[PDB]
Design a binder for these strands. Structure first.
Lengths: 156, 178, 130, 212, 55, 170
RNA sequence: GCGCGUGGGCCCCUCCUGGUAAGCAGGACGGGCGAGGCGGGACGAUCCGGACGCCGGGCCAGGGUGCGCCGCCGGGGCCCG
């Protein structure tokens, strides 16, 4: 690069989508935000105030500050061998809620629900640990109709 | 032949001995290390290592700090691995048993006048070697003037002070000066 | 005159680790020097080069310093100094020093003969009768 | 207190004599069960797919020079740090996926009970206090794995062959096996292209027998 | 005359030699850049009842 | 060299609780290579990648080989120009044994390795049906031919250290 | 915490820019030589294997096995390397 201004190499990044140009859906302003919430930062090109740099696009973070018209987000940038927490102030339009912890949050509640039953009906508790697929099993499969397949002669 | 660098963070050096030419310190370190080996007590392990630490690592605890630190537990014996220096600012010192490597002349007199006992590490090894009814107390290690000037004065987030007079306005008058 | 039985002494290298290029020049004395040159064939240990001094060549701690007679050496210069060998040094043996004159060697050897201490150089300076 | 060492020996020995007798009958029940199940399926024009492999024996076949940074990390976790070293792995999607990344540096397959016992008894060493201590007696296995219910050597061979609950603790207990030189033929082609790297399946046992 | 203008080779290795260091723990909780009003309220709120260290 | 009947099917899905089973007769050195070839085929012929499906059974079919039969092999090989189609007939005792003779004569004459060649089919052809003369001459009731290589008894001379008194007659 | 050396690099793999091209110039991921012994590639800094205390026995990688020169045969096909 010979020119490195705030918005360099942002031709396809900060551009709007095919049919998604225009003003922001009012939910972006309406959505409530809480301190410590996980937020995914996706820059919207139309709004120009509070725009995070192209580096901050695609970065999940946590809301250090909830302030008038702006959310402060702590994202971790690896500069050289040191990952540094960077505190950025992004306006509503360029920040979105993140489902990063949603699977953990879902699992915590499901684990408790099985445990709650284990305290009452069906006292034994099922394993509440994720298993990484595991190596299949046995089973008997009916060959019955098995299609005999042959490599096909080259065409061209 | 063997990749032994992928997950190993390298050996970390520590003071396994007291570098002190002082006989008494070497004799006490060996004494409490033998206790620790025979009786595996944390108090004797922490004391064994505290004896091996350097003078900068071991700061003085004053007779006003020890009074405040032992205010709730006057019964418990206050074990210091450095020197007790008196605080004249504390007019009246409370009475307590203290065991330190050294005690300044004023601090030996003040505690004894109060009715307290100035014990020694040999007396501790004889009376309470494992450390029953004893508390290991330390002085502030960052109290050193050198520690305060460590860093990069001139960096925005330093909060350090420059080494030397400097006497000029570039970089010192503000974040925007310079 | 006989030592403790001991374990076979094994020497890793009989030869003496001559310095590199000590044959080519008289100025380079054969005392070992670590090869420390940018393009030194000896330090790169390429094939055919002389061997390199290393701790691997070290002899067994138990048999190290032991002389071929199975005894260790203590260099004595006087009859009082035969007190080290006197204090139950059944393992060690005595060497008289080169400075000690034949007059004094005779006295030292008599004390050794009473103690039973073996003297390694017991024929030294014994030229006929003085 | 000095005594009771003999009392543990009696309990450990008792578990050993009963375990070998029961485990061997368990292993022979498997062959009869699989062959009969295959016969039953054959009558119904069905095929009995056997269980997909539960444990793999993985042997490093390439050396420490020029290894990629990711490949080095995966092989370190797989405890393969030197050529000719072998470790057991548990077959899971995560383990299987990372094996594919380091396939060029290893050969793997499913070990038989005979292969398991020979490695455990001829080349088996333990990690105690991070030290490689030879496995010559059942007492050592009991002093580290009875918490994991593995008092005897046969109790260990069962844990690895049948991928039991205490597999993570028993496989870590065994120190990565250090084995003799591998016969190989081509170390750069894959057992599927005629070379030796990658999955060899039942042939892992033949490869390991030479290196014991 | 002309020498190399730029190289990145080894720089990643040098970074990962002991690196990929996480950024402290105090930084994740620091009150730098926080809302001046919220911070004043926090001080007033923690300056009353058991939390208060005012004596 | 072996002859295997590898059976396979895509992994059961919600849309397809029972998937169709495919059977392939694959000649290969070992079971591991045989299952790789089966999936090389199902990946292209049926869009079933190995990770998508599973091998129900790999079954080694051994053969009785006490009588010579003419095995005709149709195959496709990729040359330096590109894929070609070829029919080769080999007279051998067993189908695995004739596949070895076909892959020996495909590497030697056409310079195609086992992974370049794909065998369309192997089927025993009777003497009347042989279309290739190199196999036809042998099929006739009585074949009398001089020993093709009677000088090959020079194996005897390596032992002799080549120091025989007279030059041996052939 | 204290501090040293370094800040002319160059090769391989793959991905590239300028150029007719270059053992040319300029970049990228990883590796290597630098600073890596040793066996092979006839010879070579970097290639292919292997990365080194001193030894004895055993195995065998890569690369080979007429004779220089350690180590080979058996089978199928082809044939003025």
């Amino acid at each position: 690069t010979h020119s490195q201004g705030y918005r360099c190499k942002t031709r396809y990044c900060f551009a709007r989508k095919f049919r998604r140009h225009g003003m922001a859906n009012l939910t972006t302003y309406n959505r409530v935000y809480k301190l410590g919430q996980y937020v995914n930062i996706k820059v919207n090109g139309a709004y120009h105030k509070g725009m995070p740099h192209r580096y901050y696009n695609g970065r999940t973070g946590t809301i250090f500050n909830i302030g008038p018209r702006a959310l402060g987000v702590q994202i971790q940038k690896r500069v050289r061998g040191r990952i540094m927490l960077k505190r950025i102030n992004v306006r509503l339009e360029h920040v979105h809620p993140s489902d990063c912890r949603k699977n953990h949050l879902e699992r915590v509640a499901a684990n408790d629900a099985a445990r709650r039953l284990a305290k009452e009906t069906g006292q034994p508790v099922p394993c509440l640990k994720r298993q990484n697929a595991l190596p299949r099993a046995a089973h008997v499969v009916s060959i019955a109709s098995a299609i005999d397949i042959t490599p096909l002669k080259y065409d061209g | 032949g063997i990749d032994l660098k992928t997950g190993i963070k390298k050996r970390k050096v520590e003071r396994k001995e007291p570098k002190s030419p002082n006989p008494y310190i070497r004799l006490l370190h060996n004494a409490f290390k033998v206790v620790y080996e025979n009786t595996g007590e944390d108090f004797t392990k922490v004391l064994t290592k505290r004896l091996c630490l350097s003078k900068t690592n071991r700061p003085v605890l004053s007779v006003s700090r020890l009074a405040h630190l032992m205010h709730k537990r006057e019964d418990k014996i206050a074990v210091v691995a450095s020197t007790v220096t008196n605080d004249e600012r504390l007019v009246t010192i409370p009475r307590m048993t203290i065991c330190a490597l050294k005690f300044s002349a004023t601090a030996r007199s003040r505690i004894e006048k109060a009715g307290g006992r100035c014990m020694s590490f040999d007396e501790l090894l004889a009376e309470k070697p494992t450390g029953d009814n004893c508390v290991l107390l330390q002085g502030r290690r960052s109290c050193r003037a050198v520690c305060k000037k460590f860093g990069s004065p001139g960096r925005p987030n330093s909060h350090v002070k420059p080494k030397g007079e400097h006497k000029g306005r570039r970089g010192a008058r503000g974040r925007h000066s310079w | 005159i006989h030592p403790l039985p001991h374990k076979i002494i094994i020497k890793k290298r009989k030869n003496k680790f001559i310095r590199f290029q000590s044959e080519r020049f008289v100025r380079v004395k054969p005392s070992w020097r670590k090869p420390r040159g940018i393009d030194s064939p000896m330090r790169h240990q390429y094939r055919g080069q002389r061997p390199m001094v290393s701790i691997g060549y070290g002899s067994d701690k138990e048999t190290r310093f032991m002389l071929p007679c199975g005894f260790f050496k203590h260099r004595i210069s006087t009859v009082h100094e035969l007190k080290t060998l006197f204090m139950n040094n059944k393992t060690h043996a005595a060497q008289i020093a080169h400075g000690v004159s034949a007059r004094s060697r005779k006295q030292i050897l008599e004390e050794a003969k009473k103690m039973g201490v073996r003297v390694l150089n017991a024929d030294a300076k014994l030229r006929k009768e003085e | 207190r000095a005594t009771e060492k003999e009392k543990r020996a009696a309990l450990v020995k008792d578990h050993a004599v009963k375990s070998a007798q029961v485990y061997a009958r368990y292993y022979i029940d498997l062959v009869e069960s699989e062959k009969k199940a295959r016969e039953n399926a054959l009558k119904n024009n069905q095929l009995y797919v056997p269980d997909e492999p539960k444990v793999y024996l993985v042997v490093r076949i390439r050396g420490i020079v020029g290894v990629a940074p990711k490949v080095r990390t995966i092989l370190s976790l797989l405890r393969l740090r030197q050529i000719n070293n072998a470790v057991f792995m548990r077959c899971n999607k995560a383990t299987l996926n990372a094996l594919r990344i380091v396939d060029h540096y290893v050969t793997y397959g499913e070990p038989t009970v005979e292969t398991i016992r020979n490695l455990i008894y001829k080349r088996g060493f333990a990690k105690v206090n991070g030290q490689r201590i030879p496995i010559v007696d059942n007492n050592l296995i009991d002093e580290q794995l009875s918490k994991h219910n593995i008092l005897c050597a046969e109790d260990l061979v069962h844990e690895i062959f049948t991928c039991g609950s205490s597999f993570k603790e028993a496989n870590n207990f065994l120190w990565p096996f250090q084995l003799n030189s591998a016969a190989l033929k081509d170390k750069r082609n894959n057992f599927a292209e005629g070379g030796d790297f990658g999955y060899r399946g039942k042939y892992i046992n033949e490869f390991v027998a030479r290196m014991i | 005359a002309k020498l190399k203008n730029h190289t990145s080779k080894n720089q990643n290795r040098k970074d990962h030699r002991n690196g990929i260091k996480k950024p402290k723990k105090s930084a994740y909780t620091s009150h730098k850049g926080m809302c001046p009003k919220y911070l004043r309220n926090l001080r007033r709120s923690r300056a009353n009842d058991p939390r208060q260290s005012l004596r | 060299m072996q002859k295997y009947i590898v059976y396979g099917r895509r992994l059961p899905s919600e849309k397809f609780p029972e998937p169709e089973v495919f059977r392939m007769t694959i000649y290969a050195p070992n079971e591991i290579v045989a299952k790789s070839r089966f999936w090389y085929h199902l990946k292209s012929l049926k869009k079933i990648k190995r990770t998508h499906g599973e091998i129900l059974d790999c079954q080694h079919i051994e053969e009785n080989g006490d009588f010579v039969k003419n095995f005709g092999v149709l195959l496709r090989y990729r040359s330096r120009v590109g894929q070609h189609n070829m029919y080769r007939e080999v007279r051998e005792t067993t189908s695995a044994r004739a596949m070895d003779k076909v892959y020996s004569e495909m590497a030697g004459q056409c310079r195609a390795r086992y992974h370049d060649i794909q065998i369309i089919n192997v089927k025993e052809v009777a003497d009347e049906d042989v279309r290739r003369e190199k196999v036809a001459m042998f099929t006739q009731k009585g074949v009398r031919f001089p020993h093709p290589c009677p000088y090959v008894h020079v194996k005897r001379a390596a032992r002799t250290a080549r120091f025989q008194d007279r030059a041996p007659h052939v």
